[PDB]
């Protein structure tokens, strides 16, 4: 009488309704430590008119520049970023080269009400489960460092935990990977990942190849409002900016000036 | 190719150490509401000598029998099971045919200190994330209901949340799926889930095909102590028993009598 088939079919139809009442992105994240309720990453980053959306980055050091800010208070930085209308906050959690910490993400989560990006070098599901538990809303994935199969797997794992992902790209090969893997958010990074050189025309070159459905982020070498508006005109949604703010005494004042 | 390869190599080294200090199974199940700390599923179920290890099942109704217990108090049942030395508790969460509930799992989790099995009809990552959040320590996967690739995908997802999986088999094709998926807890179900017929010689046929290092569970039609000893002699580790306890007046005393 095929009882198992009948039970499966009923369970399938009921599962559709459960997901509408409690989506993936609320099921997993609601047990992280948001002070109130998890925020919509896509809505936070999607530009609606000409408003300046900035993912502001908590970054003490960089491989190429060394220590960027000697007096580093990641909680204070995060609060000033949100106070000054950041769309989201990127938290460096890589410890050895960037002098970040996964604990910074957990501490920042408890006192912020905008999406948080775990900025790290992710290649394994454990790191994405960490990001969920420690309070990230989306994770960085680097297309150059991952095979097509591995990237798609990690994107899928993130989605099944309720996390979005920023997929960083540097060229057309990277972009082809990101699109085929199903990335929703594409970050065009102006800085070369080996030589730290800058190609500041990369958005002109790559945006014409990005599908309509994607959020486009620009990262690196951003320190002037006029250039941000130029990138907006090319179709950029939001901007990931770190060192420019961390170089300044008042990182909140530097963020405000770019809006 | 320089700095990004260096960063990735140090991150991989650090990740090995981190996993030893906070395994997958502790990182994720910290999200759940264990009273104290998450329990080791394998050690709970592995038979060391000839001790009787029972996964006692909280089950109101079944497709073949109708309502088994009209006066159904899932929390009281679970407490009575743990009091009488159950190795673990199986919570039926399927609501339509078994009259279980996902909320029973969450309620039972707050007042129990032994592993909990989510017993349901699982075919999607969302249901396994549910099992994590709601307090399960392992999940039921039915090999007859899943393709070989899909069974491995869901088992891996459970593993990446820190959950074990009881992979239920009824024949050699089911076993071949379980082997491809890498299951280490294998349940031999005497009951045919399509027509609800019963094969009580199934352990004798299938156990020689299973490495004895796996955890072998026997399921269905288990009602007398003497047959359990026979099944232990064949190499069964632990026994999943529901209806026999639920149709008794004092399920705790019925469980104690089988030890
Ligand atoms: Cl706190
Ligand atoms: Cl409570
Ligand atoms: K605190
Ligand atoms: K309660």
- DSSP secondary structure of B136-172: -SEEEEEGGGS-HHHHHHHHHHHHHTT-EEEEEESSH
| CA distance from start to end of chain B | 63
Say whether residue B153 is in contact with chain A using an 8 A CB cutoff. Answer: no
Largest Cα span, chain A: 73
Element (H, E) at A155: helix A148-160
Cβ-based neighbours of B59, under 8 Å, separated by 6 or more: B68, B90, B92, B98, B100, B119, B242, B243, B246
B241: enclosing H helix or E strand: strand B238-241
* Facing A126 at nearest CB: one of B2, B15, B125: B15
Upper half-sphere CA count for residue A222 (Cβ side, 13 Å): 33
Residue A204 gets which letter from DSSP?
H
Beta-strand ranges (E) seen in B28-115 are: 54-58, 61-62, 66-67, 88-92
**Rounded (10°) angle between helices A148-160 and A125-134:** 30
Q: Is A168 a catalytic residue?
A: yes
- Nearest-CA distance from B2 to chain A in Å? 5
Is there a catalytic annotation at residue A219? Answer: yes
User: Would you call B168 a catalytic residue per the annotation?
Assistant: yes
The span from the CA of A166 to the CA of A250, in Å, is 27
Q: Please report where in the chains the tokens 């990127």 appear, as a residue.
A: A90
CA angle at A107 for the pair A106 and A113, rounded to the nearest 5°: 85
* A84 DSSP 8-state letter: T
CA B252 – CA B142 distance, rounded (Å): 28
Give how far B233 is from chain A: nearest CA, Å: 31
Identify each DSSP E strand in B69-205 by its residue range: 88-92, 116-119, 138-142, 164-169, 185-189
**A49 among known catalytic residues:** no
B19 touches chain A (CB under 8 A): yes
Q: Is residue B135 within 8 Å of residue B33, measured between CB atoms?
A: yes
CB A99 within 8 A of CB A61: yes
A84 CA: distance to closest CA in chain B (Å): 32
CB contact under 8 A, A133 and B31: yes
Closest to A127 in 3D by CA, of B38, B28, B181: B28
Closest CA relative to residue A185, chosen from A100, A110, A127, A115: A115
Distance of CA A49 to the CA centre of its chain: 21
In whole angstroms, what is the distance from residue B65 CA to residue B68 CA? 7
B26 interface with A at CB cutoff 8 Å: no
Structural method: X-ray
Which H or E run includes B181? helix B172-181
Give B194's DSSP letter: T
The two tokens of residue B190 are 């005497």
CB-based contact A83:A255 (threshold 8 Å): no
First to last CA, chain A: 65
Give contacts of B28 with chain A, Cβ < 8 Å.
129, 133
CA gap A124, B148 in Å, rounded = 23
Resolution to 1 decimal place, in Å: 2.0
Contact of B133 with chain A, judged by CB distance below 8 Å, is answered with: yes
- Domains of chain A in start order, with CATH, are 1-259 (3.20.20.70)
Kindly name the residue from A62, A90, A106, A189 that is annotated as catalytic: A189
Instruction: Tell me the two tokens of residue A211.
Output: 């599908």
Whole-number Å distance, alpha carbon A139 to ligand 4 midpoint, is 34
Partner-chain contact B3 A196, CB within 8 Å: yes
What is the sign of the dihedral through the CA atoms of A173, A176, A182 and A186?
positive
Q: Which among A8, A95, A129 has the least Cβ separation from residue B27?
A: A129
Q: Does B143 touch chain A (CB under 8 A)?
A: no
Asked if residue B152 lies in contact with residue B182, where contact means CB atoms within 8 angstroms, the answer is yes
| CA atoms of A240 and A57, how far apart (whole Å) | 7
How far apart are alpha carbons B56 and A110 in whole angstroms? Answer: 39
A144-148: Cβ within 8 A, 24+ apart = A144/A168, A144/A169, A144/A170, A144/A173, A144/A174, A144/A193, A144/B4, A145/A121, A145/B4, A145/B8, A146/A177, A148/A177, A148/A180, A148/A181
Identify whether the C-beta of residue A255 lies closer than 8 Å to the C-beta of residue A93: no
Ligand nearest to the CA of A33: 1
Q: Does A125 touch chain B (CB under 8 A)?
A: yes
User: Tokens 């031999």 map to which residue?
Assistant: B188
Chain B residues in contact with A126 (beta carbon < 8 A): 15, 18-19, 24, 27, 160
Active-site option among B82, B130, B219, B251: B219
Q: Which of A168, A177, A243, A251 is catalytic?
A: A168
* CB-CB neighbors (< 8 A) of B142 in chain A: 4
Q: Are strands A138-142 and B138-142 parallel, antiparallel or unpaired?
A: unpaired
Residue found under tokens 């703010």: A245
Best A96, A126, A159, A174 member to test B by mutation, with max B CBs in 10 Å, is A126
Q: Is A67 on the interface with B (CB under 8 A)?
A: no
CA quadruple A231, A234, A238, A239: dihedral sign: negative
Closest CA–CA distance from residue A222 to any residue of chain B (Å): 21
Is B230 an interface residue toward A (CB < 8 Å)?
Answer: no
**What is the torsional sign of CA B180, B185, B188, B189?**
negative
Instruction: Give, for A245, the enclosing helix (H) or strand (E).
Output: helix A243-247
């Amino acid at each position: 009488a095929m009882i198992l088939d009948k039970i499966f079919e009923k369970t399938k139809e009921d599962l559709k309704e459960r997901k509408l009442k409690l989506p993936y992105d609320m099921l997993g994240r609601s047990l992280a430590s948001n002070p109130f309720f998890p925020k919509d990453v896509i809505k936070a980053l999607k530009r609606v008119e000409k408003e300046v959306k900035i993912i502001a980055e908590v970054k003490k050091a960089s491989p190429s520049k060394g220590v960027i800010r000697e007096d580093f208070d990641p909680l204070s930085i995060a609060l000033n970023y949100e106070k000054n209308k950041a769309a989201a906050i990127s938290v460096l959690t890589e410890p050895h080269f960037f002098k970040g910490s996964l604990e910074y993400l957990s501490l920042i989560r408890r006192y912020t009400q905008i999406p948080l990006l775990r900025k790290d070098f992710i290649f394994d599901e454990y790191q994405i489960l960490e990001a969920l538990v420690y309070g990230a809303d989306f994770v960085l994935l680097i297309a150059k460092m991952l095979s097509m199969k591995e990237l798609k797997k990690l994107l899928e794992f993130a989605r099944h935990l309720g996390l979005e992902a920023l997929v960083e790209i540097h060229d057309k090969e990277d972009l082809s990977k990101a699109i085929f893997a199903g990335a929703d958010i594409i970050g065009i990074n102006h800085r070369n990942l080996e030589d730290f050189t800058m190609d500041m025309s990369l958005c002109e070159k790559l945006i014409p190849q990005i599908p309509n459905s994607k959020i486009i982020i620009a990262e690196s070498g951003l320190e002037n409002k006029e250039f941000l508006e130029h990138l907006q005109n090319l179709g950029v949604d939001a901007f990931l900016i770190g060192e420019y703010f961390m170089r300044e005494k008042d990182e909140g004042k530097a963020l405000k000036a770019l809006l």
